[PDB]
Amino acid sequence: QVQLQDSGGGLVQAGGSLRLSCAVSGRTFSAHSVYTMGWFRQAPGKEREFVARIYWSSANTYYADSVKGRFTISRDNAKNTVDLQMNSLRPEDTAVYYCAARDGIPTSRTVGSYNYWGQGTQVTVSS
Amino acid sequence: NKDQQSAFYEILNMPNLNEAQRNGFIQSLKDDPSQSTNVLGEAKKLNESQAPK
C-alpha cells in the first residue's frame, strides 16, 4: 500500500552532520493520509531500534531520548518525502538506518508496529 | 515561533562550530520548530566540547 526508499547514508567524521531521505509513494496516498513514518537504526551487534517518528497528517514528531536535539525528523507532503537531519554525530550513531511506515497510529515504538520498510542506508561515523 | 528565532541567532554566532555544523543545526530548527530548545541545547554542548585547547 505504501512503498519506501531510503537514501543519504555515508561516511562522516565525528561531530559531523548528515541528512537522510525517504521517498514515499502509494496509489491512494495524499497530504493528510493517516500514516506514521519513522526511522529505525541497526547498530553493529544490535537489533533495529527506534529513532524518531512523524505523523504524516499533522507532522507531530517524537524522538528517542538518545537523539533528541541532535536529530530532527520532517516530512514534505508535496514531494512525498520524510527526512532525518543528523547533527553532532558520534561513533555510536554508526548503523544502518531504515525508513518505515504504518497505515495508522503505532501501538508501540518497536519494529512490529511498522508494516512498510525501506531497504536501509548505511551510516559510518569515524573518530 | 520565538524560541525558534532566538535559537537561530544564537547558533549563527556560536564561535566553536564549523560551517557544516552551524548549517546542520539551523536546518534542524527549520525542520522541527517544536525541538528548538533541545536543538539549541545540543548545539551549545557541541560548542562547549569543541572549545579550542
Numbering used by the authors:
A (entry chain C): 1 to 127
B (entry chain H): 2804 to 2856
Task: Recite the paper's sentences.
Single-domain antibodies (sdAbs), including camelid-derived nanobodies and human-derived variable heavy domains (VH), have emerged as a transformative class of biologics due to their small size, high stability, and superior tissue penetration. Derived from Staphylococcus aureus, Protein A is a 42 kDa surface protein consisting of five homologous immunoglobulin-binding domains (A–E) and an S region that functions as a signal sequence and cell wall-binding region (XM). It strongly interacts with the CH2-CH3 region within the Fc domain of IgG1, IgG2, and IgG4 and can also bind certain antibody fragments. Using this approach, we successfully reprogrammed multiple human-derived VHs and camelid-derived nanobodies to acquire high Protein A affinity, enabling efficient, tag-free purification via industry-standard Protein A affinity chromatography.
Additionally, we selected the camelid nanobody VHH3, which targets human TNFα, shares low sequence similarity with n501, and does not bind to Protein A, to further evaluate the versatility of our model. We also identified the L90Q mutation in both VHH3-M1 and VHH3-M3. The glutamine at position 90, similar to glycine at position 74 in n501, forms hydrophobic interactions with Protein A. However, its side chain can form hydrogen bonds with the side chains of N92 and R20, which are essential for binding to Protein A. This interaction can draw the side chain of R20 closer to D39 of Protein A domain D. In contrast, leucine at position 90 cannot form hydrogen bonds with N92 and R20, thereby removing the constraint on the side chain of R20. The interaction pattern between VHH3-M1 and Protein A closely resembles that of n501, with a root-mean-square deviation (RMSD) of 0.643 Å.
